[PDB]
Amino acid sequence: SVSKANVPKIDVSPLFGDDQAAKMRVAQQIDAASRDTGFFYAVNHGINVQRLSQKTKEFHMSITPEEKWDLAIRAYNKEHQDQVRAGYYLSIPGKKAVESFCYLNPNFTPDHPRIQAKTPTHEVNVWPDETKHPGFQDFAEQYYWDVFGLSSALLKGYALALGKEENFFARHFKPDDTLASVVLIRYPYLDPYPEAAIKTAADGTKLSFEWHEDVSLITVLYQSNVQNLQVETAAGYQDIEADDTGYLINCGSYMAHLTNNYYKAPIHRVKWVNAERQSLPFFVNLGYDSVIDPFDPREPNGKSDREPLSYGDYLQNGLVSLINKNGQT
Ligand SMILES: CC(C)[C@@H](OC(=O)[C@@H](NC(=O)CCC[C@H](N)C(=O)O)[C@@H](C)S)C(=O)O
Ligand SMILES: [Fe+2]
């Protein structure tokens, strides 16, 4: 059998308030988790995840093939050359099980300066017809802001954990320009399940998605209650238990870069499970021009031998690298 990963539940509610000592006690827990397996569950986060799950189910189960083509990213529909990130990512029956819908900052409107400039990684979201999916767009945009709020609170905790003032990361995470995305992923129950959608790891584990580090500052993830994730530790791959009341948090490779690998981006993978389930990540991305000077909290003078990297450069290159390594989702 596989051992269970140490993934503590951390009450993050103090990060929304003004009790500075209580915030430090949360920051310590974040520090400990970040230095151990790299994962923790945020609890007492204030988001109605049951409703998120319900609204997402209604969307995934009602969208039709016609609509999926009309919303498809360029990888599936050559007519949509402006859709690299935002839109529908189709399943391929008999070959690829997973399907998903990605959306970006609702403030990326046609008149936004970065949209006007055609800056890479910025796009205007695409949405299904309101009459076919009543309330969906409004729900989804509001969810973006609810999880943005949680994420800003978590970033205050990571900053305090690293010995910085609480706005160290959050000052770069702004509603007008964040490159953060929500992805609503459907992992289906299929009978029979196509073997081509099942990968096998070197250790023999059947997978839906291979090992990787995240392209993010941090990742803020809701999943259904079906165990699927594993994290690589010194003791090998360990199972991360599901908790459909909490958000699973981990660092991405931009955090690892900034901290000189003090807070590593944990390597993780997704086991194959033949169950109808949801994986709904929010990738906490900064602005296109955001640069945080790398440091090293294990060094007395705090200095690191890494060169500064703008977030936009990091992101554009990382999203491409993911596709090249683990395939187009
Ligand atoms: C493991 C889960 C978290 C989830 O995987 C992802 O969400 C993957 N994410 C992506 O493929 C990047 C999507 C980027 C998005 N299209 C964007 O433009 O921002 C992993 C590499 S983290 C899952 O498979 O359950
Ligand atoms: Fe990931």
Side-chain angles (χ1 to χ4, degrees), residues 2-3 5 7-56 58-73 75-117 119-128 130-173 175-194 196-198 200-205 207-240 242-263 265-298 300-302 304-306 308-329:
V2 180
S3 276
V7 183
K9 299 180 193 302
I10 300 176
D11 177 346
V12 298
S13 62
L15 296 175
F16 289 95
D18 302 318
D19 185 329
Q20 312 307 331
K23 291 194 222 176
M24 293 290 285
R25 290 185 290 270
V26 178
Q28 183 281 321
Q29 297 172 71
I30 291 172
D31 179 69
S34 297
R35 295 160 63 183
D36 186 19
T37 68
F39 284 89
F40 66 95
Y41 275 104
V43 304
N44 303 299
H45 49 68
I47 297 184
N48 186 346
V49 294
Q50 186 277 344
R51 185 162 181 263
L52 166 68
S53 182
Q54 179 67 32
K55 297 294 183 182
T56 297
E58 291 169 5
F59 168 72
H60 280 152
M61 301 309 171
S62 68
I63 192 170
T64 62
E66 179 185 49
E67 300 175 273
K68 297 176 190 180
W69 287 124
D70 294 350
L71 296 171
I73 60 170
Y76 299 95
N77 181 340
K78 293 187 163 178
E79 300 183 14
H80 296 168
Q81 286 303 301
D82 289 333
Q83 294 181 237
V84 179
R85 295 181 70 194
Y88 212 91
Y89 291 50
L90 285 71
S91 68
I92 304 176
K95 297 295 178 185
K96 174 181 178 278
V98 74
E99 60 188 275
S100 62
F101 176 78
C102 172
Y103 62 103
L104 309 183
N105 192 331
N107 292 325
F108 296 165
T109 48
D111 64 5
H112 186 286
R114 288 298 195 171
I115 295 292
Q116 285 286 315
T119 301
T121 76
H122 302 75
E123 305 171 11
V124 182
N125 289 333
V126 296
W127 299 101
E130 170 73 22
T131 56
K132 299 186 169 66
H133 299 272
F136 175 70
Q137 176 175 354
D138 297 327
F139 174 79
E141 290 180 339
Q142 181 62 60
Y143 178 64
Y144 191 99
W145 299 120
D146 286 352
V147 72
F148 178 102
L150 171 59
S151 298
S152 293
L154 294 169
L155 287 179
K156 293 176 185 173
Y158 274 97
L160 292 174
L162 288 162
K164 305 301 190 195
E165 68 94 12
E166 76 177 9
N167 291 134
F168 183 84
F169 298 116
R171 73 200 160 175
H172 300 276
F173 184 57
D176 282 353
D177 57 34
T178 175
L179 288 165
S181 62
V182 170
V183 188
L184 306 181
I185 309 168
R186 173 185 183 194
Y187 278 96
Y189 171 75
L190 298 170
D191 182 19
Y193 205 107
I198 305 172
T200 288
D203 72 7
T205 305
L207 305 177
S208 284
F209 195 73
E210 261 286 19
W211 72 268
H212 65 282
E213 292 183 345
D214 284 359
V215 179
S216 70
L217 180 60
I218 66 168
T219 297
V220 176
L221 174 70
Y222 170 82
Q223 301 194 314
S224 310
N225 187 202
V226 177
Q227 198 282 317
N228 69 100
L229 295 171
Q230 300 188 306
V231 56
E232 192 176 44
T233 70
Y237 279 90
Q238 295 181 333
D239 284 334
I240 295 174
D243 184 347
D244 72 355
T245 70
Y247 277 90
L248 187 67
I249 316 303
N250 62 273
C251 292
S253 58
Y254 197 79
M255 186 67 85
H257 186 245
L258 295 175
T259 65
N260 197 34
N261 223 26
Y262 175 68
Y263 290 174
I267 291 171
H268 55 286
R269 65 191 190 186
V270 180
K271 291 198 288 175
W272 170 69
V273 188
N274 193 5
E276 188 69 49
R277 69 191 183 78
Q278 299 173 329
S279 183
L280 317 180
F282 181 69
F283 295 107
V284 175
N285 293 323
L286 304 181
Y288 191 84
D289 289 326
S290 300
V291 183
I292 293 178
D293 291 331
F295 61 104
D296 189 343
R298 286 157 313 184
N301 65 13
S304 127
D305 291 323
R306 289 186 186 234
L309 178 59
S310 76
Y311 203 92
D313 278 358
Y314 165 79
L315 186 62
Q316 190 176 196
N317 293 324
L319 292 185
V320 169
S321 295
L322 277 177
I323 291 164
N324 291 344
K325 187 209 171 292
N326 284 1
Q328 172 65 63
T329 63

Coordinates of all heavy atoms in Angstrom, one line a residue, residues 251-303, unseen atoms left out:
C251 N 2.6 25.5 -3.2 CA 3.3 26.5 -4.0 C 3.6 26.0 -5.4 O 3.7 24.8 -5.6 CB 4.7 26.7 -3.3 SG 4.6 27.5 -1.7
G252 N 3.7 27.0 -6.3 CA 4.2 26.7 -7.6 C 5.6 27.1 -7.8 O 6.3 27.7 -6.9
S253 N 6.1 26.9 -9.0 CA 7.5 27.1 -9.3 C 8.0 28.6 -9.2 O 9.2 28.9 -9.0 CB 8.0 26.5 -10.5 OG 7.3 26.9 -11.7
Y254 N 7.1 29.6 -9.3 CA 7.5 30.9 -9.1 C 7.9 31.2 -7.6 O 8.8 31.9 -7.3 CB 6.5 31.9 -9.5 CG 7.0 33.4 -9.8 CD1 7.7 33.7 -10.9 CD2 6.8 34.4 -8.8 CE1 8.2 35.0 -11.1 CE2 7.3 35.6 -9.0 CZ 8.0 35.9 -10.2 OH 8.4 37.2 -10.3
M255 N 7.2 30.6 -6.7 CA 7.5 30.7 -5.3 C 8.8 30.0 -5.0 O 9.7 30.5 -4.3 CB 6.4 30.0 -4.4 CG 6.7 30.2 -2.9 SD 6.5 31.9 -2.3 CE 4.7 31.9 -2.1
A256 N 9.1 28.9 -5.7 CA 10.3 28.2 -5.5 C 11.5 29.0 -6.0 O 12.5 29.1 -5.4 CB 10.3 26.8 -6.2
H257 N 11.3 29.7 -7.1 CA 12.3 30.5 -7.7 C 12.6 31.7 -6.7 O 13.8 31.9 -6.4 CB 11.9 31.1 -9.0 CG 13.0 31.9 -9.7 ND1 12.9 33.3 -9.9 CD2 14.2 31.5 -10.1 CE1 14.0 33.7 -10.5 NE2 14.8 32.6 -10.7
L258 N 11.6 32.4 -6.2 CA 11.7 33.5 -5.4 C 12.4 33.2 -4.1 O 13.1 34.1 -3.5 CB 10.4 34.2 -5.1 CG 9.6 34.8 -6.2 CD1 8.2 35.3 -5.6 CD2 10.4 35.9 -6.8
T259 N 12.2 32.0 -3.5 CA 12.7 31.6 -2.2 C 14.0 30.8 -2.3 O 14.4 30.2 -1.3 CB 11.7 30.9 -1.4 OG1 11.3 29.6 -2.0 CG2 10.4 31.7 -1.2
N260 N 14.5 30.6 -3.5 CA 15.7 29.8 -3.8 C 15.4 28.4 -3.3 O 16.2 27.7 -2.7 CB 16.9 30.3 -3.1 CG 18.2 29.6 -3.7 OD1 18.2 29.3 -4.9 ND2 19.2 29.4 -2.9
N261 N 14.2 27.9 -3.5 CA 13.8 26.5 -3.2 C 13.6 26.2 -1.7 O 13.5 25.0 -1.4 CB 14.7 25.4 -4.0 CG 13.9 24.3 -4.5 OD1 12.7 24.4 -4.9 ND2 14.6 23.1 -4.7
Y262 N 13.6 27.3 -0.9 CA 13.2 27.1 0.5 C 11.8 26.6 0.6 O 11.5 25.7 1.4 CB 13.4 28.5 1.3 CG 12.9 28.5 2.7 CD1 13.6 27.7 3.7 CD2 11.9 29.2 3.2 CE1 13.2 27.7 5.1 CE2 11.5 29.3 4.5 CZ 12.1 28.5 5.4 OH 11.7 28.6 6.8
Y263 N 10.9 27.2 -0.1 CA 9.5 26.6 -0.3 C 9.5 26.0 -1.7 O 9.3 26.7 -2.7 CB 8.4 27.7 -0.2 CG 8.2 28.2 1.2 CD1 7.3 29.2 1.4 CD2 8.8 27.7 2.4 CE1 7.0 29.7 2.7 CE2 8.6 28.2 3.6 CZ 7.7 29.2 3.8 OH 7.5 29.8 5.0
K264 N 9.7 24.7 -1.8 CA 9.7 24.0 -3.0 C 8.4 24.0 -3.7 O 7.3 24.1 -3.0 CB 10.2 22.6 -2.8 CG 11.6 22.5 -2.2 CD 12.1 21.1 -2.0 NZ 14.0 22.4 -0.7
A265 N 8.3 23.9 -5.0 CA 7.1 23.6 -5.7 C 7.0 22.0 -5.6 O 7.8 21.4 -6.3 CB 7.1 24.0 -7.1
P266 N 6.1 21.4 -4.8 CA 6.1 20.0 -4.7 C 5.7 19.3 -6.0 O 4.8 19.8 -6.7 CB 5.0 19.7 -3.6 CG 4.2 20.9 -3.6 CD 5.1 22.1 -4.0
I267 N 6.4 18.2 -6.3 CA 6.0 17.4 -7.4 C 4.8 16.5 -7.1 O 4.8 15.9 -6.0 CB 7.2 16.5 -7.8 CG1 8.3 17.4 -8.4 CG2 6.8 15.5 -8.8 CD1 9.6 16.7 -8.7
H268 N 3.8 16.5 -7.9 CA 2.6 15.7 -7.6 C 2.0 15.2 -8.9 O 2.4 15.7 -10.0 CB 1.6 16.6 -6.8 CG 1.3 17.9 -7.5 ND1 2.1 19.0 -7.5 CD2 0.1 18.3 -8.1 CE1 1.6 20.0 -8.2 NE2 0.4 19.6 -8.6
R269 N 1.1 14.3 -8.8 CA 0.5 13.6 -10.0 C -0.9 13.2 -9.6 O -1.3 13.2 -8.4 CB 1.3 12.4 -10.4 CG 1.4 11.3 -9.4 CD 2.4 10.2 -9.8 NE 2.3 9.1 -8.9 CZ 3.1 8.1 -8.9 NH1 4.1 8.0 -9.7 NH2 2.9 7.0 -8.0
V270 N -1.7 12.8 -10.6 CA -3.1 12.5 -10.4 C -3.4 11.1 -10.8 O -3.2 10.7 -11.9 CB -4.0 13.3 -11.4 CG1 -5.5 13.0 -11.2 CG2 -3.7 14.9 -11.2
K271 N -3.7 10.3 -9.8 CA -4.1 8.9 -10.0 C -5.4 8.8 -10.8 O -6.3 9.6 -10.7 CB -4.4 8.2 -8.7 CG -3.2 8.0 -7.9 CD -3.4 6.9 -6.8 CE -4.3 7.4 -5.8 NZ -4.6 6.3 -4.7
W272 N -5.4 7.7 -11.6 CA -6.6 7.3 -12.4 C -7.6 6.7 -11.4 O -7.3 5.8 -10.7 CB -6.3 6.3 -13.4 CG -7.6 5.7 -14.0 CD1 -8.4 6.4 -14.8 CD2 -8.1 4.4 -13.9 NE1 -9.5 5.5 -15.1 CE2 -9.3 4.3 -14.6 CE3 -7.6 3.3 -13.2 CZ2 -10.0 3.1 -14.7 CZ3 -8.3 2.1 -13.2 CH2 -9.5 2.1 -14.0
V273 N -8.8 7.3 -11.4 CA -9.9 6.7 -10.6 C -11.1 6.8 -11.5 O -11.4 7.8 -12.1 CB -10.2 7.6 -9.3 CG1 -11.2 6.9 -8.5 CG2 -8.9 7.7 -8.6
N274 N -11.9 5.7 -11.6 CA -13.1 5.7 -12.5 C -14.3 6.2 -11.7 O -15.1 5.5 -11.2 CB -13.3 4.4 -13.1 CG -14.4 4.5 -14.2 OD1 -14.8 5.6 -14.6 ND2 -14.7 3.3 -14.8
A275 N -14.3 7.5 -11.5 CA -15.4 8.2 -10.7 C -15.6 9.6 -11.3 O -14.7 10.2 -11.8 CB -14.9 8.3 -9.3
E276 N -16.9 9.9 -11.3 CA -17.3 11.3 -11.7 C -16.9 12.3 -10.6 O -17.4 12.1 -9.5 CB -18.8 11.3 -11.9 CG -19.4 12.5 -12.5 CD -19.0 12.7 -13.9 OE1 -19.1 11.8 -14.7 OE2 -18.5 13.9 -14.2
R277 N -16.1 13.2 -11.0 CA -15.6 14.1 -9.9 C -15.1 15.4 -10.5 O -15.1 15.6 -11.8 CB -14.4 13.4 -9.2 CG -13.2 13.2 -10.0 CD -12.1 12.3 -9.3 NE -10.9 12.2 -10.1 CZ -10.0 13.1 -10.2 NH1 -10.0 14.2 -9.4 NH2 -9.0 12.9 -11.0
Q278 N -14.8 16.4 -9.7 CA -14.4 17.7 -10.0 C -13.1 18.1 -9.5 O -12.7 17.7 -8.4 CB -15.5 18.7 -9.4 CG -16.9 18.5 -9.9 CD -17.9 19.4 -9.2 OE1 -17.6 19.7 -8.0 NE2 -18.9 19.7 -9.8
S279 N -12.3 18.8 -10.3 CA -11.1 19.4 -9.8 C -11.1 20.8 -10.3 O -11.2 21.1 -11.5 CB -9.9 18.7 -10.4 OG -8.7 19.1 -9.9
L280 N -11.2 21.8 -9.3 CA -11.5 23.2 -9.6 C -10.4 24.1 -9.1 O -10.5 24.7 -8.0 CB -12.8 23.6 -9.1 CG -14.0 22.6 -9.2 CD1 -15.3 23.1 -8.6 CD2 -14.2 22.2 -10.7
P281 N -9.2 24.1 -9.7 CA -8.1 25.0 -9.3 C -8.3 26.5 -9.6 O -8.8 26.9 -10.6 CB -6.9 24.5 -10.0 CG -7.5 23.9 -11.3 CD -8.8 23.3 -10.9
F282 N -7.7 27.3 -8.7 CA -7.4 28.7 -9.0 C -5.9 28.8 -8.9 O -5.3 28.6 -7.9 CB -8.1 29.5 -7.9 CG -7.9 31.0 -8.1 CD1 -8.5 31.7 -9.1 CD2 -7.2 31.8 -7.1 CE1 -8.4 33.1 -9.3 CE2 -7.2 33.1 -7.2 CZ -7.8 33.8 -8.3
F283 N -5.3 29.3 -10.0 CA -3.9 29.5 -10.1 C -3.6 30.9 -9.8 O -4.0 31.8 -10.5 CB -3.4 29.1 -11.5 CG -3.6 27.6 -11.7 CD1 -4.6 27.1 -12.6 CD2 -2.8 26.7 -11.1 CE1 -4.7 25.7 -12.8 CE2 -2.9 25.3 -11.3 CZ -3.9 24.9 -12.1
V284 N -2.9 31.2 -8.7 CA -2.6 32.5 -8.2 C -1.4 33.0 -8.9 O -0.3 32.6 -8.7 CB -2.4 32.5 -6.7 CG1 -2.0 33.9 -6.2 CG2 -3.7 32.1 -5.9
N285 N -1.7 33.8 -10.0 CA -0.7 34.4 -10.8 C -0.7 35.9 -10.5 O -1.7 36.5 -10.2 CB -1.1 34.2 -12.3 CG -1.0 32.7 -12.7 OD1 -0.1 32.0 -12.3 ND2 -2.0 32.3 -13.6
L286 N 0.5 36.5 -10.7 CA 0.6 38.0 -10.5 C 0.3 38.7 -11.8 O -0.4 38.2 -12.6 CB 2.0 38.2 -9.9 CG 2.4 37.5 -8.6 CD1 3.8 37.8 -8.2 CD2 1.3 37.7 -7.5
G287 N 0.7 40.0 -11.8 CA 0.5 40.7 -13.1 C 1.6 40.5 -14.1 O 2.7 40.0 -13.7
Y288 N 1.4 40.9 -15.3 CA 2.4 40.6 -16.4 C 3.8 41.1 -16.1 O 4.8 40.5 -16.4 CB 1.9 41.1 -17.7 CG 2.7 40.6 -18.9 CD1 2.4 39.4 -19.5 CD2 3.6 41.4 -19.5 CE1 3.1 38.9 -20.6 CE2 4.3 41.0 -20.6 CZ 4.1 39.8 -21.1 OH 4.8 39.3 -22.2
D289 N 3.8 42.4 -15.5 CA 5.1 43.0 -15.3 C 5.6 42.8 -13.9 O 6.6 43.5 -13.5 CB 5.0 44.5 -15.6 CG 4.9 44.8 -17.0 OD1 5.5 44.1 -17.8 OD2 4.2 45.8 -17.5
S290 N 4.9 42.1 -13.0 CA 5.3 41.9 -11.6 C 6.7 41.2 -11.5 O 6.9 40.2 -12.1 CB 4.3 41.1 -10.9 OG 3.0 41.7 -10.9
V291 N 7.6 41.8 -10.8 CA 8.8 41.2 -10.5 C 9.1 41.2 -9.0 O 9.0 42.3 -8.4 CB 10.0 41.9 -11.2 CG1 11.3 41.2 -10.9 CG2 9.8 42.0 -12.6
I292 N 9.4 40.1 -8.4 CA 9.8 40.1 -7.0 C 11.2 39.7 -7.0 O 11.6 38.7 -7.7 CB 8.9 39.2 -6.2 CG1 7.5 39.7 -6.2 CG2 9.5 39.0 -4.8 CD1 6.5 38.9 -5.5
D293 N 12.1 40.4 -6.3 CA 13.5 40.1 -6.3 C 13.7 38.8 -5.5 O 13.3 38.7 -4.4 CB 14.3 41.3 -5.8 CG 14.3 42.5 -6.7 OD1 14.1 42.3 -7.9
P294 N 14.4 37.8 -6.1 CA 14.6 36.6 -5.4 C 15.4 36.8 -4.2 O 16.3 37.7 -4.1 CB 15.3 35.7 -6.4 CG 15.0 36.3 -7.7 CD 14.8 37.8 -7.5
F295 N 15.1 36.0 -3.1 CA 15.8 36.0 -1.9 C 16.0 34.6 -1.4 O 15.6 33.7 -2.0 CB 15.1 36.9 -0.8 CG 13.7 36.4 -0.5 CD1 13.5 35.8 0.7 CD2 12.7 36.7 -1.3 CE1 12.2 35.4 1.1 CE2 11.4 36.3 -1.0 CZ 11.1 35.6 0.2
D296 N 16.7 34.5 -0.2 CA 17.0 33.1 0.3 C 16.9 33.2 1.8 O 17.8 33.7 2.5 CB 18.4 32.7 -0.1 CG 18.6 31.2 0.3 OD1 17.9 30.6 1.1 OD2 19.5 30.6 -0.3
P297 N 15.7 32.8 2.4 CA 15.5 32.9 3.9 C 16.4 32.0 4.7 O 16.2 32.0 5.9 CB 14.1 32.6 4.1 CG 13.5 32.4 2.7 CD 14.6 32.3 1.7
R298 N 17.2 31.2 4.1 CA 18.1 30.3 4.9 C 19.5 31.0 5.0 O 20.3 30.6 5.8 CB 18.3 28.9 4.3 CG 17.0 28.1 4.4 CD 16.9 27.0 3.4 NE 17.2 27.6 2.1 CZ 17.1 26.9 0.9 NH1 16.8 25.6 0.9 NH2 17.3 27.6 -0.2
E299 N 19.7 32.1 4.3 CA 21.0 32.8 4.3 C 20.9 34.1 5.2 O 20.0 34.9 5.1 CB 21.4 33.3 3.0 CD 23.1 31.4 2.5 OE1 24.1 32.2 2.8 OE2 23.1 30.2 2.7
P300 N 21.9 34.2 6.1 CA 21.9 35.4 7.0 C 21.7 36.7 6.3 O 20.9 37.5 6.9 CB 23.4 35.3 7.6 CG 23.7 33.9 7.6 CD 23.0 33.3 6.4
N301 N 22.3 36.9 5.2 CA 22.0 38.2 4.5 C 20.8 38.2 3.5 O 20.5 39.2 2.9 CB 23.3 38.6 3.7 CG 23.7 37.7 2.6 OD1 22.8 36.8 2.2 ND2 24.9 37.8 2.1
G302 N 20.1 37.1 3.5 CA 19.0 36.9 2.7 C 19.2 36.9 1.2 O 18.2 36.9 0.4
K303 N 20.4 36.9 0.7 CA 20.7 37.1 -0.8 C 20.6 35.8 -1.5 O 21.0 34.7 -1.0 CB 22.0 37.8 -1.0 CG 21.9 39.3 -0.8

